[PDB]
Amino acid sequence: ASVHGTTYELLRRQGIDTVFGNPGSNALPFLKDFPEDFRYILALQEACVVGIADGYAQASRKPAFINLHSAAGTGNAMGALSNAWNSHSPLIVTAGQQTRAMIGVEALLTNVDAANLPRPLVKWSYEPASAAEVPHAMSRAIHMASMAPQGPVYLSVPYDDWDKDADPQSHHLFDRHVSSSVRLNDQDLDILVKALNSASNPAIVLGPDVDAANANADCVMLAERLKAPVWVAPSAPRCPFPTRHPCFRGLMPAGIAAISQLLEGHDVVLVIGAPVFRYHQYDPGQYLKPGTRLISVTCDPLEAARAPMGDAIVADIGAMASALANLVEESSRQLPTAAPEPAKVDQDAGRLHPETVFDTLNDMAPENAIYLNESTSTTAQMWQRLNMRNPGSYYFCAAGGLGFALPAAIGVQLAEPERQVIAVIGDGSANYSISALWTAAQYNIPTIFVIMNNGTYGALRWFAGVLEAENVPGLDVPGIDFRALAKGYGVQALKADNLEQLKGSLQEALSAKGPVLIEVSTVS
Amino acid sequence: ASVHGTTYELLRRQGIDTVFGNPGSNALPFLKDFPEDFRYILALQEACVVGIADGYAQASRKPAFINLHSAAGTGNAMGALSNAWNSHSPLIVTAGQQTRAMIGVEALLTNVDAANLPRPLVKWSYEPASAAEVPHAMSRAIHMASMAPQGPVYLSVPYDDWDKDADPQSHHLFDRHVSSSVRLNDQDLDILVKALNSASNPAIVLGPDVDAANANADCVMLAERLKAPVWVAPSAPRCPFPTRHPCFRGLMPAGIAAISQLLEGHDVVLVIGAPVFRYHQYDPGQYLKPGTRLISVTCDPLEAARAPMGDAIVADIGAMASALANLVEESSRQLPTAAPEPAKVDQDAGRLHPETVFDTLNDMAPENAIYLNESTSTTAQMWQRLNMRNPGSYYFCAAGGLGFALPAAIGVQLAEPERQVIAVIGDGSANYSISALWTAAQYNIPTIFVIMNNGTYGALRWFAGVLEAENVPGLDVPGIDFRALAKGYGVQALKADNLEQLKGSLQEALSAKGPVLIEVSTVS
Amino acid sequence: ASVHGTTYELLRRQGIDTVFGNPGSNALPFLKDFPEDFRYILALQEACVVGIADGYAQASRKPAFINLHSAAGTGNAMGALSNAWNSHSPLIVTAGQQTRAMIGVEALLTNVDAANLPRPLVKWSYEPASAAEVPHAMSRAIHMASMAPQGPVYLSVPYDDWDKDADPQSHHLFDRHVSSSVRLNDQDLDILVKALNSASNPAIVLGPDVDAANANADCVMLAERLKAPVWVAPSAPRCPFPTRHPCFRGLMPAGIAAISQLLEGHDVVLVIGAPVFRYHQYDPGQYLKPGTRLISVTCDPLEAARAPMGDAIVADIGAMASALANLVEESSRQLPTAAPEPAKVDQDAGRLHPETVFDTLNDMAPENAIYLNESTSTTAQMWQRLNMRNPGSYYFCAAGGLGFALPAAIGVQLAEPERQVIAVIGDGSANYSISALWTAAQYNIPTIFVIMNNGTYGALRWFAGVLEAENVPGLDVPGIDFRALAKGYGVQALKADNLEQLKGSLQEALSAKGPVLIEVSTVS
Numbered sequence A, B, C: 001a002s003v004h005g006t007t008y009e010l011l012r013r014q015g016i017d018t019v020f021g022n023p024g025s026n027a028l029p030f031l032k033d034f035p036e037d038f039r040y041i042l043a044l045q046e047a048c049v050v051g052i053a054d055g056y057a058q059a060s061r062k063p064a065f066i067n068l069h070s071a072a073g074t075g076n077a078m079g080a081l082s083n084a085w086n087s088h089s090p091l092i093v094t095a096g097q098q099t100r101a102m103i104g105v106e107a108l109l110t111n112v113d114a115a116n117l118p119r120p121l122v123k124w125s126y127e128p129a130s131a132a133e134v135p136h137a138m139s140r141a142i143h144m145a146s147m148a149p150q151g152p153v154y155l156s157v158p159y160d161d162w163d164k165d166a167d168p169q170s171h172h173l174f175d176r177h178v179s180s181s182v183r184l185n186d187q188d189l190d191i192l193v194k195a196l197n198s199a200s201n202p203a204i205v206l207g208p209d210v211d212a213a214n215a216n217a218d219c220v221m222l223a224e225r226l227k228a229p230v231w232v233a234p235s236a237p238r239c240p241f242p243t244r245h246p247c248f249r250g251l252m253p254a255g256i257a258a259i260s261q262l263l264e265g266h267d268v269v270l271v272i273g274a275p276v277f278r279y280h281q282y283d284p285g286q287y288l289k290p291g292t293r294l295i296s297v298t299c300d301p302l303e304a305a306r307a308p309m310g311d312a313i314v315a316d317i318g319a320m321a322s323a324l325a326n327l328v329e330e331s332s333r334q335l336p337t338a339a340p341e342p343a344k345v346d347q348d349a350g351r352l353h354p355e356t357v358f359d360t361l362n363d364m365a366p367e368n369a370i371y372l373n374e375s376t377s378t379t380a381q382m383w384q385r386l387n388m389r390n391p392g393s394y395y396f397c398a399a400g401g402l403g404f405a406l407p408a409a410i411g412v413q414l415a416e417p418e419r420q421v422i423a424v425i426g427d428g429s430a431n432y433s434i435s436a437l438w439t440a441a442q443y444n445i446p447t448i449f450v451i452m453n454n455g456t457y458g459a460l461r462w463f464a465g466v467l468e469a470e471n472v473p474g475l476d477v478p479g480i481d482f483r484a485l486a487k488g489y490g491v492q493a494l495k496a497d498n499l500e501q502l503k504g505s506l507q508e509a510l511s512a513k514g515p516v517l518i519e520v521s522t523v524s
């Protein structure tokens, strides 16, 4: 067998059937003879390739396979890899390298020092020392991406390796099963359970690894047993809990003092599947107030090590959430009361307040919609206004890197064909990965793109105003016609200049058979 | 003085007056109070920021200054940095980092292990250990980028450093002059000159560092004295010689055997300002035929070390070319005969042959036009059909990384306002950095963009055919409306479906006052 | 030809005939069939291997070739590489790697991520992608080590590569000549010369790259023409000037304020072949006083970039010193007056003051002796008391890394068999690389080792006293019998408890036919 045939067999046997890519010559011997049972998804720029793959992996809860071209292709994707690192996305990034005989002279298209290029944004990065090693290296990549804490990996393969003979002993790779589905030993788990049962006013904080693990329902049971309020950890990449459940208390503000104030009076705070904490703004103060103890369950040693406070347990989130939910006592305390309905913001017949948009989306979208957010000045309002009952309903760039939501929304929609995906993207953010729209058109992936057009990098203008910072250049983005960009890439385009037009356009978009972009004129 | 004021003073004193950027919050304390004598050039994605800066630096023959946001912004630019490495572009890449007090907890927007992120594509990469070090680190960056061999550098600066007090002793940085304008010692230079004078059939090969050094005219004198044919080294990023000079012999094919055959019978081959050699295709054979000696002059130790053949001298190209041109004897041999006019390809009233496009551009463009090439299946024909008399007339992605020409053409046009820039870009390549078009519109930088629309990744289809490779996915890019994309970003848009429409559109574009995109229907 | 035969041919053709090594199995296919015209120098630990090679390279002014075993051998040498980086030592470090078929499984003796292991202490680090690339990679290593600024490089080679067929086209590597012997262009050199001629009170500062280049005599001529005092730059790794020449002013103190005070009143300070500056102690103040301009000539871009003051020129030190010495005018100013004789310190019939030792060495040693210094509390006195007339007469650990002098003294003595080497090493420092003594015994390399036994890490005790730092552990090293250690490794051993015994032992050592260690009881 050739290295090509053995490698595709390994991929198939390990559950991979899709290649997200942008082709080049170094990968031609990999891509030729492409197997009929595999699908290739082309995108026009590598940030888009990796963003699509990332959304696919996060929504599918399985690894996604990528093929890029050499250093330039890899490099074009490194912003996307920053997000994938922070979201623990299981991405297998392969990159085509020059033929081994041309690497020393540094021929055009040579990826110099290839394994160092994606660092520090990958869990493992490698170039094999021989062709016959390629299947084994691919096995390593698959498992490294997939073991907790999941994350992106990188494998560079010389052009000429694919046609070489494989080692027959590579067959032992095909059906390897590698598990990291582990939980705290019984003795120490019983201590934790007793601490939770004994708490007088517990609180729960959930992060994105809960949604990745599909541990959401277990966390609902846990919260109901403990009669505890539930927050989402700051800078949330995913939504880990039903947002109209009575226990839900919303997105934590991403500041040190704000969080310790929120947690004051709670004697035990159990954090599951989040870093402690993904703060953002400068908000100095106490990490915790006196009388609060924090206990973190995390799938990631790097998270446990860097927490500035609390105990930690490094384990699989799915396994731990299920165990905890089924072991804790039912508290006799009263169940928390649901948060009230958010206020309706006054809206005239002009430009749309973002709150209006979110309220209308919540009114018209299916109950099993999936939302993506890259509307950076409106996140707090979005989190208050969308009733997200189901797992897998929200994605936000986990490293804050813009250019995620537009391509990721296409990958999510590919992963969840029955669930309508609605990406809410600012006019600034929409540009970073604009060319991803073409993939939605070409493959007829029916994502809806809602462009929040305020003409500015609003979150930056806001921050400069808080700072009283004057004479800051580059904060405005006038003169972009998003309907024309959509037309450029073959996607149906609508405008919404007022509330009536927003409802009419959303009605049209929801019944369409293909992707749709709606440009919304929002208040500036 | 603050670190901000000292740093901007250093930049001004060192000749920097322009910041190419995409803003974020980590850089707000750098960008606020932006000096009135500086200009900020915004682009909508960081590949575009760096590509624009790169074209500006290459055409201006001086460093260009960039400011990006953290890891995601840096990462979005890494493909662009691959090209800048290969072109020896002097780019000073700064990236905003989180406040020092938030780096340990890895707050959102922290650039983890920042100095490692752009490696191996930078000459120097650094994060200062204290605020007061920032001016000194900036000095280091400026000089590292600017010393031969020029190249990109990276500096990560925490948000909170800018407002801190600077060290008064930083004033010693302001007027430092650092020179690498060096040439071979007299004794060894006399040996080289004697070897050139004694050659019976010398040949010259020129690469991009000749054009960077503006050594073109000196090389013309050298060629005329030695009565030697002149080739451009393969995979050419720049044009180092007038292409209708009698000695000019064109672009070398990027293959080992092809080049040694071309050089057969030439007893001494002098290579200036090129790697030896930037081969591309697999074309095995002899590096040199018997009877050929090669001597390379390079500004880059890494080039000299990796050449598989020949002697080398590591020195400044400008200094060496000027010395050699003025020291060699006038040979009594006959001056080479100019290459004939290229053939006119038969053209019907339908889709355009690329040869037709290039011939029409050469007919209608000013004699001091500047061309950029990212039409990857048509490069050989382009090089034969454009009369480029002047230095600085050609750019091509030096690492083969697509997404260079569209933004670089804007930066070149900013650098050379009197010289009409014409970027010839394939329909595939145009997508990688499409959003750069907006910068041309916003700043009214009057670049002309010629999109070669054949509906395919033609160079890849070509290569797959040579290989007889079947079932290769992802090679076609149907369904892109480039006039609509231009409209999207505010750039005047024309179509050319046939030769009459090509001439009419070029006539319109050449008289326009702003940027123009022309979508040309080319033969598939 | 095999890769082994081609590689040894390349080495021989490039002037390498000695391998400094500690063997292991991964290198057995390299070391077998060892050519009869090569010499292998074994040392018992890899810090010793590299230190010996380093002294050999520095004294020979040519590259030295090393072979180590995998990661553990490489790692044992990394302290030695820190010194070699700072001294610009041209070292070619090869390390044996596992067979390619065993690298993926990470068999015992695999060097994981090998090229990253020695970073950041090497100029270039590489593992070839195929066996046939090994000769080309070796060529790259040779030239990278040897081009200015010289320095160490690293090449990792899989076991199985050596026996494979080489590429016949590797013959083009054998006789490549690569030059970096360059100087400032004539126009800018004339400006520099005019600035030197016009100075009213010039000063010269020389660093180790002057001695490496054998530019010492040229610098003497330069100093005499300009009638300028000459200092050695701080933390001096080498001696660049005759220390009893009338212009010589000694070792600069390694502090910011001390140096600017020393240079006050000097209108032009010309620094050659040194960083600006290798400060050590905290001594804050002005980099330069008003009225002093500094101009640096350096072979190293990294030095030129980081200087906090002055202009710089990046060029070959040999070429620049020769040009400057022969172009400057003869000043009519008076020649500086020689420094007086140092004072004789009162010495009783007990333990030796270090000043006594140095005075006695200067009295009894040949005029062409070579000294090494790793007696860290006595350096200033050593520099005042030794008349070093000739180039190549002094070495000191260039990164301050102890464990250099003992092995380096053996390599220097191998390089300079007619020049008596005398290493003056503290009792603390002697331990780091003690096993190097065996190589001197086995190869009968007749180095004299003078152990300054004060029972303490004296320079650290001194510093703790300046700090008024109390309760510092680990500063005393009682209970080491150096005569017994010498016996252990086969080296003749003497003691000197008083001045009479010091003279008698030195008389014995100087007439011996093999290496000798003298343990001197020095004042504490």
Ligand SMILES: Cc1ncc(Cn2c(C)c(CCOP(=O)(O)OP(=O)(O)O)sc2=O)c(N)n1
Residues within 6 Å of the ligand: A079, A374, A375, A376, A377, A378, A400, A401, A402, A403, A425, A426, A427, A428, A429, A430, A432, A454, A456, A457, A458, A459, A460, B022, B023, B024, B025, B069, B072, B073, B076
């Ligand atoms: C790749 C990248 N570049 C720049 C930024 C900086 N950035 C920028 C540019 C923001 C403005 C986004 O504007 P928008 O129009 O998408 O949304 P708002 O107007 O609601 O802020 S928010 C922010 O962090 C970033 N996070 N990621």
Ligand SMILES: Cc1ncc(Cn2c(C)c(CCOP(=O)(O)OP(=O)(O)O)sc2=O)c(N)n1
Residues within 6 Å of the ligand: A022, A023, A024, A025, A069, A072, A073, A076, B079, B374, B375, B376, B377, B378, B400, B401, B402, B403, B425, B426, B427, B428, B429, B430, B432, B454, B456, B457, B458, B459, B460
């Ligand atoms: C960033 C990146 N991704 C992918 C490639 C691979 N690539 C691709 C995708 C090519 C096709 C470019 O198509 P085009 O339409 O711009 O021009 P032609 O149709 O004339 O080839 S040529 C080539 O090397 C690349 N070099 N750089």
Ligand SMILES: Cc1ncc(Cn2c(C)c(CCOP(=O)(O)OP(=O)(O)O)sc2=O)c(N)n1
Residues within 6 Å of the ligand: C079, C374, C375, C376, C377, C378, C400, C401, C402, C403, C425, C426, C427, C428, C429, C430, C432, C454, C456, C457, C458, C459, C460
């Ligand atoms: C490898 C290493 N480890 C530790 C040190 C720290 N060090 C130490 C341990 C010194 C004391 C050396 O003692 P000595 O006996 O050799 O000489 P003195 O008694 O004259 O100081 S000086 C100094 O910088 C070092 N420089 N290098």
Ligand SMILES: [Ca+2]
Residues within 6 Å of the ligand: A359, A362, A363
């Ligand atoms: Ca409602």
Ligand SMILES: [Ca+2]
Residues within 6 Å of the ligand: A060, A414, A415, A416, A417
């Ligand atoms: Ca699915």
Ligand SMILES: [Ca+2]
Residues within 6 Å of the ligand: A426, A427, A428, A452, A453, A454, A455, A456, A457, A458
């Ligand atoms: Ca906006």
Ligand SMILES: [Ca+2]
Residues within 6 Å of the ligand: B359, B362, B363
């Ligand atoms: Ca014509």
Ligand SMILES: [Ca+2]
Residues within 6 Å of the ligand: B060, B414, B415, B416, B417
């Ligand atoms: Ca200009």
Ligand SMILES: [Ca+2]
Residues within 6 Å of the ligand: B426, B427, B428, B452, B453, B454, B455, B456, B457, B458
């Ligand atoms: Ca095309």
Ligand SMILES: [Ca+2]
Residues within 6 Å of the ligand: C359, C362, C363
């Ligand atoms: Ca004396």
Ligand SMILES: [Ca+2]
Residues within 6 Å of the ligand: C060, C414, C415, C416, C417
């Ligand atoms: Ca010798």
Ligand SMILES: [Ca+2]
Residues within 6 Å of the ligand: C426, C427, C428, C452, C453, C454, C455, C456, C457, C458
């Ligand atoms: Ca001591």
Ligand SMILES: [Mg+2]
Residues within 6 Å of the ligand: A116, A117, A118, A119, A120, B116, B117, B118, B119, B120
């Ligand atoms: Mg990197």
Ligand SMILES: [Mg+2]
Residues within 6 Å of the ligand: C116, C117, C118, C119, C120
């Ligand atoms: Mg290392």
